């Protein structure tokens, strides 16, 4: 394998326009990166002009106007540079990516079947088509532009810092690694603890998934409380892990706050020292500190670019490996002969095409097809010596081992290999349709034909009137994924696309779509009476296409057996808008649910406020220090700077303490809330009906994913998100108050430009995240078509529609190209306008500060303090606004959770108050006039007003046929599916009114395909009773003949078992389920087919265990029970739920059971 190619090789599909776009985007990214430190330098110059000229009001006003003009120039430069970078990079990346997808699909479909058998697999090719978005649509589309932009920012910030104040820049460059390593430690610890918590949540999801896959026994054996308790224990483990995670996150980010505040205290003291020694200015000091931080952040932000570049190198190496391979199929003449008789006879001296994956195996040894012209020849044989290899031979897949295949005295190997393809028709087992129009999915057989030939191609063969009468319309883009759910329409569309093709050398490889409907009847009229005759190796049915064919040509052991007469039989084993009032109500309900932890939240809230306030205070101090930088009194300057540094150290200590407090307590309340939510969701789902678990969207994997995702989503929505909202609200409040009390009418101006600043900063955050959306979703349709074409590469090569598929792929990928260009242009223009308005607002604020100072309304100190404090307030508001979409997502998860919780259940496992039940029952049950009881699929209605009787202390051994409601009478007994017309009376009264959980504690079951959950067989057996103890388990194991086999292993009771455990035999788990049913010790017992596939001694042991269970008390056994039913008084015999005579095993009345019950026994004997 290859670990990657050269980075430049990723640009192999860049034409002149792509080169121009890349150059323009690179220049724009470089200038946009350099602009921000240049703006810091210009801010330093403006502040120096605005503070150092306090006495000369005219000079400072003129210089402030000049530097506001420079701010406008920088804003325009950022506008142009960001527009260029974003739009050009996105467009060039999209163009190169689309060119690569087109070329890759063409190259892949141009290869032979060998390249997808022993070289790169079909799944690998589809995955490469998927991850072309990851490779080229990501790394060189925008990540390259971001890399250039951030490297430019880093270099420009370093240059600005080291040209303004090199002393302060050097000490700041020394400082930056401290914050970097503190943040790295915090991120590492947080990621590790989050991974551990995620593993705990995954284990909890495994627990709930195991609960719902085995819901049939969990509901029956009143194990819902046990499952809830186990889930709660797992959730408590995950909650302790989340507590550790929250404490670690709070401590780490409080350490970051403490370190940055202390470092700013040191840097501000050193800047005061530099101003005191007349080395530089205060504005220069602030700007050089900020510029070195911006350079450090820029250098840190180019790591994702390098990660994307490495991933791109490896994935481009893969894609180039597929593309650059020259197919061996086209190494032949490709132009030899294309003028042969349409009625051709394929001759095979020796069969070949031993697949290159396993060249040692020779499935086809030696035989000849010797097909008749105009007469249909069939083949049949075993699966191991299959017939599809003959199809591969005929279609010239170029794998000749020893012999050679030739058509009517002309070698296929030396043939054109182009004309042969349309000469040879094909309808394989797979329909192999494509995500394109139905007309195209037929037209691709003969491209030159118009709609008319398509019409008679779909008319002569099969019926196309379904398409005409299709509610979608005359033309259809194969619906969504496939036109037909059944597959008959798919097969007949394939037949029509072969009809536009030449059927001269037709090949029909049967149909694996389970067609046993009128689709086969229509197939009888399509390509079963066609005038010519060639290989039709249909083996779906014995008489289908074989009885009518004049040559059976049975194939076995890679050689043709007796051929010609079809009368002889062949031995084989073949079978034959959205209102937010509802969201607010849901949030209030969730908060009421989270009442017990409100106190904790409140403390965390307090911490948030403090931290919020702290930030403002810090900004204030910083701005205040700047005012002290421009002060003629040196001693007063030193005293004020030292006071501010000490206050800032105190702020750092408070920031650490209250950050740990806020985040620890907010994560504590979030963990408690998500644990409570998960527990309530589990209770709600376990309170539902069995039909609810039957539904597909409530599947086990679906349920686990839904629960985990919803809980995680709301957790964030309620934790760090609300933390940040409260913190930023406190910051904004404190900042506005400080600005207004210092110098109003300028804070009013900054509030006037407040929306501009918050919008521009939100767009800055978006740019940091990335402006290109979901790359895979953008090319979803083209990716789907490419994957379908790759999976059906055999059909594409057979119909010679490689060019048509590639052209359809270009037509599918053009709209994403146009959309990406337009999105890039809109994003670039919007981002540039936002930045220009931001810098215009900054210039306006500083000029208004100058105007207030010149008029004598205010002073420099108050103006600069208000300005900086309001700017940090705007930054906090930006954070809140950019976190709003997570609030939207959390509201969606919240309404999902509260629609799951508030769903009502028809059946109540834990009834509030019902008719009390005695400790021991009689066992008599009457299922009078029962019905199908299957809401999920009401198409079928079994139990046509059927009634069933079970006398107290007696057994029923009903047998029935397969799929006659055999395994559903017990479901009616346990109230899994409520019978609408059925009266199920237990102990003389209906089960609907007694305590359901109490009865389910008094009825045992041995389900068909026995449930083997848990980790140890000991717990599986103990599941039968709450007070399992040890004597009960031992006696149950002994009674059901389940003690010797378990003790055979050294582990015995404490043995690894379950879904992830060691797989054991069916008889062992059946007897384990029987032992669990016995240890349940129930008056009414329900059995199933516990003898599906067992050896002689295991069969005898299972029958003995069943005999003992029946001898115990009242029981219902529904197994086949061909003999030795222990003389049940009655046996219920039914035909699809209809009323029928109850033929007994002893055959007292040998009239009804003679033709039903005894027939299967005679057949098996
Ligand atoms: N790509 C492959 N690599 C290796 N062995 C293969 C491959 N494709 C098919 N086989 C083997 O080919 C043998 C014969 O089956 P084959 O004729 O290919 O298909 P089939 O589905 O059995 N045909 P049919 O009987 O007409 O339905 C089997 O033993 C397969 O394992
Ligand atoms: N999830 C389901 N949704 C709808 N119908 C179902 C579902 N599962 C089973 N059925 C049908 O409900 C009926 C139950 O037949 P029943 O004999 O009780 O079970 P079975 O497992 O089919 N028995 P058997 O064939 O003897 O092993 C049959 O018509 C089933 O096909
Ligand atoms: Mg086949
Ligand atoms: Mg069953």
UniProtKB/Swiss-Prot annotation:
InterPro entries: AAA+_ATPase, ABC1_TM_dom, ABC1_TM_sf, ABC_transporter-like_ATP-bd, ABC_transporter-like_CS, P-loop_NTPase, Type_1_exporter. It is a multi-pass membrane protein. Its main location: membrane. It catalyses: (indol-3-yl)acetate(in) + ATP + H2O = (indol-3-yl)acetate(out) + ADP + phosphate + H(+); brassinolide(in) + ATP + H2O = brassinolide(out) + ADP + phosphate + H(+); 24-epi-brassinolide(in) + ATP + H2O = 24-epi-brassinolide(out) + ADP + phosphate + H(+); 24-epi-castasterone(in) + ATP + H2O = 24-epi-castasterone(out) + ADP + phosphate + H(+). Disruption phenotype: Reduced brassinosteroid export. Lower petiole angles under red plus far-red light. The abcb1 abcb19 double mutant is severely dwarfed, with excessive leaf and petiole curling, reduced internode lengths, increased stem and silique waving and skewing, and exhibits poor flower fertility due to short stamen filaments not sufficiently elongated to position the anthers above the stigma during anthesis; this phenotype is associated with lower free auxin levels in blue light and reduced length of epidermal cells in the middle of stamen. CDD domains: ABC_6TM_Pgp_ABCB1_D1_like, ABC_6TM_Pgp_ABCB1_D2_like, ABC_MTABC3_MDL1_MDL2. Signal peptide: none annotated. Changing residue 618 to A: Reduced brassinolide-triggered ATPase activity and altered brassinosteroid exporter activity. Ubiquitous, with high levels in peduncles. Mostly localized in young developing tissues, including meristems, as well as root and shoot apices. Glycans are attached at residues 195, 672, 698. Transport capacity is stimulated by the chaperone protein FKBP42/TWD1. Transport activity inhibited by 1-N-naphthylphthalamic acid (NPA), cyclopropyl propane dione (CPD), cyclosporin A, verapamil and quercetin. ATPase activity is specifically activated by bioactive brassinosteroids in a dose-dependent manner, including brassinolide (BL), 24-epiBL, 24-epicastasterone (24-epiCS) and castasterone-alkyne; BL binding leads to structural changes. Inhibited by vanadate. Residues 346-576, 925-1161 form the ABC transporter domain. Brassinosteroid exporter that, in conjunction with ABCB19, supports the accumulation of exogenous brassinosteroids (BR) in the apoplast, thus promoting BR signaling initiation involving the specific receptor BRI1 and required for plant growth and stress responses. Auxin efflux transporter that acts as a negative regulator of light signaling to promote hypocotyl elongation. May contribute to the regulation of leaf position and morphology during PHOT1-mediated blue light responses involving auxin distribution, especially in low light fluence. This is ABC transporter B family member 1.
């Amino acid at each position: 394998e290859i670990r990657g190619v050269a980075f430049k090789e990723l640009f192999r599909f860049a034409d002149g326009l792509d080169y121009v776009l890349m150059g323009i985007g690179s220049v724009g990214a470089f200038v946009h990166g350099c602009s921000l430190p240049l703006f810091l330098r210009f801010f330093a110059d403006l502040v120096n002009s605005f503070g150092s000229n306090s006495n000369n009001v005219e000079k400072m006003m003129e210089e402030v106007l000049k530097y506001a003009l420079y701010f406008l120039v920088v804003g325009a430069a950022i506008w142009a540079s960001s527009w260029a970078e974003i739009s050009c990079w996105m467009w060039s990346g999209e163009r190169q990516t689309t060119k690569m997808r087109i070329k890759y699909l063409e190259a892949a479909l141009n290869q032979d079947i060998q390249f997808f058998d022993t070289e790169v697999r079909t799944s690998d090719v589809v995955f490469a088509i998927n991850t072309d978005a990851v490779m080229v649509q990501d790394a060189i589309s925008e990540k390259l532009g971001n890399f250039i932009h951030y490297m430019a920012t880093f270099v420009s910030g370093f240059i600005v810092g080291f040209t303004a104040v090199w002393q302060l820049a050097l000490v700041t460059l020394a400082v930056v690694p401290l914050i970097a390593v503190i943040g790295g430690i915090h991120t590492t610890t947080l990621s590790k603890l989050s991974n551990k918590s995620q593993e705990s949540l995954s284990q909890a999801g495994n627990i709930v998934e195991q609960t719902v896959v085995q819901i049939r026994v969990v509901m029956a054996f009143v194990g819902e409380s046990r499952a809830s308790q186990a889930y709660s224990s797992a959730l408590k483990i995950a909650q302790k892990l989340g507590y550790k995670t929250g404490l670690a996150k709070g401590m780490g980010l409080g350490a970051t706050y403490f370190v940055v505040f202390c470092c700013y205290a040191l840097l501000l003291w050193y800047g005061g020292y530099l101003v005191r020694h007349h080395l530089t200015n205060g504005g220069l000091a602030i700007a050089t500190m900020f510029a070195v931080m911006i350079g450090g952040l820029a250098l840190g932000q180019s790591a994702p670019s390098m990660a994307a570049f490495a991933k791109a190198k490896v994935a481009a190496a893969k894609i180039f490996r597929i593309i650059d391979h020259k197919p061996t199929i086209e190494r032949n003449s490709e132009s030899g002969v294309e003028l042969d008789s349409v009625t051709g006879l394929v001759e095979l001296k020796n069969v070949d095409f031993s697949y290159p994956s396993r060249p040692d195996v020779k499935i086809l040894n030696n035989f000849c097809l010797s097909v008749p012209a105009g007469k249909t020849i069939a083949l049949v044989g075993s699966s191991g010596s299959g017939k599809s290899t003959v199809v591969s031979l005929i279609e010239r897949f170029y794998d000749p081992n020893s012999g050679q295949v030739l058509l009517d005295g002309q070698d296929l190997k030396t043939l054109k290999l182009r004309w042969l393809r349309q000469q040879i028709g094909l309808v394989s087992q797979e329909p192999a349709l494509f995500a394109t129009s139905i007309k195209e999915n037929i037209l691709l057989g003969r491209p030159d034909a118009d709609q008319v030939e398509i019409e008679e191609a779909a008319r002569v063969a099969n019926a196309h009137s379904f398409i005409i009468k299709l509610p979608d319309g005359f033309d259809t883009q194969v619906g969504e994924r496939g036109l037909q759910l059944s597959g008959g329409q798919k097969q007949r569309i394939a037949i029509a696309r072969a009809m536009l093709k030449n059927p001269a050398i037709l090949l029909l490889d049967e149909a694996t779509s389970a067609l046993d409907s009128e689709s086969e009847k229509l197939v009888q009229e399509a390509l079963d009476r066609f005038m010519i005759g060639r290989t039709t190796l249909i083996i779906a049915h014995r008489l289908s296409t074989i009885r009518k064919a004049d040559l059976v040509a049975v194939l076995q052991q890679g050689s043709v057996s007796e051929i010609g007469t079809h009368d002889e039989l062949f031995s084989k084993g073949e079978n034959g808008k959205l209102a937010f009032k509802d969201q607010a109500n849901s949030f209030w309900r969730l908060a009421k649910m989270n009442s017990p932890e409100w106190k904790y939240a409140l403390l965390g809230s307090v911490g948030s406020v403090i931290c919020g306030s702290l930030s403002a205070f810090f900004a204030y101090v910083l701005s205040a220090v700047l005012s002290v930088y421009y002060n003629p009194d040196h001693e007063y300057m030193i005293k004020q700077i030292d006071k501010y540094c000490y206050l800032l150290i105190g702020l750092s200590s408070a920031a650490l303490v209250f950050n740990t407090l806020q985040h620890s307590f907010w994560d504590i309340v979030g963990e408690n809330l998500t644990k409570r939510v998960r527990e309530k969701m589990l209770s709600a789902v376990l309170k539902n009906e069995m039909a609810w678990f039957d539904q597909e969207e409530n599947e086990s994997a679906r349920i686990a994913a839904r629960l985990a995702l919803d809980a995680n989503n709301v957790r964030s929505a309620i934790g760090d998100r609300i933390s940040v909202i409260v913190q930023n609200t406190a910051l904004m409040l404190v900042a506005c108050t400080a600005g207004f009390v210092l110098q109003w009418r300028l804070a009013l101006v900054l509030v006037a430009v407040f929306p501009v600043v918050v919008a521009a900063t939100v767009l800055q955050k978006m740019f940091m995240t990335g402006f290109s959306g979901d790359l895979e979703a953008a090319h979803a349709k083209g990716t789907q078509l490419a994957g379908e074409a790759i999976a059906n590469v055999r059909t594409v090569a057979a119909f010679n529609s490689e060019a048509k598929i590639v052209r359809l792929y270009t037509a599918n990928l053009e709209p994403p190209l146009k959309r990406c260009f337009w999105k890039g242009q809109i994003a670039g223009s919007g981002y540039g306008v936002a930045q220009f308005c931001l810098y215009a607002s900054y210039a306006l604020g500083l000029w208004y500060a100058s105007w207030l100072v010149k008029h004598g309304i205010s002073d420099f100190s108050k103006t600069i303090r208000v300005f900086m404090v309001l700017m940090v307030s705007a930054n906090g508001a930006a954070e809140t606004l950019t976190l709003a979409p997570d609030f939207i997502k959390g509201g969606q998860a919240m309404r999902s959770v509260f629609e799951l919780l508030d769903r009502k259940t028809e059946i109540e496992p834990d009834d509030p108050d019902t008719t009390p039940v005695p400790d021991r029952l009689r066992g008599e049950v009457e299922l009078k006039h029962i019905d199908f009881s299957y809401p999920s699929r009401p198409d079928i209605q079994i139990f046509r007003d059927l009634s069933l009787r079970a006398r107290a202390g007696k057994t029923l051994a009903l047998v029935g046929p397969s799929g006659c409601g055999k395994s559903s009478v017990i479901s009616l007994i346990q109230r899994f599916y409520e019978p609408s017309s059925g009266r199920v009376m237990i102990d003389g009264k209906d089960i609907r009114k007694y305590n359901l959980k109490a009865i389910r504690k008094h009825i045992a079951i041995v389900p068909q395909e026995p449930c083997l959950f848990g980790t140890t067989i000991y717990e599986n057996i103990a599941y039968g009773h709450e007070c399992a103890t040890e004597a009960e388990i031992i006696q149950a194991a002994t009674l059901a003949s389940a003690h010797k086999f378990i003790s055979a292993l050294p582990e015995g009771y404490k043995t690894y078992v379950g879904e992830r455990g060691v797989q054991l035999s069916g008889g062992q788990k059946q007897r384990i389920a029987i032992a669990r049913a016995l240890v349940r010790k129930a008056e009414i017992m329900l059995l199933d087919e516990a003898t599906s596939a067992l050896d002689a001694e295991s069969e005898r042991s299972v029958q003995e265990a069943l005999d003992q269970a029946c001898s115990g008390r009242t029981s219902i056994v529904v197994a086949h029970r061909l003999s030795t039913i222990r003389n049940a008084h009655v046996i219920a015999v039914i035909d699809d739920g209809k009323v029928a005579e109850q033929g007994s095993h002893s055959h007292l009345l040998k009239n009804h059971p003679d033709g039903i019950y005894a027939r299967m026994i005679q057949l098996q004997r």
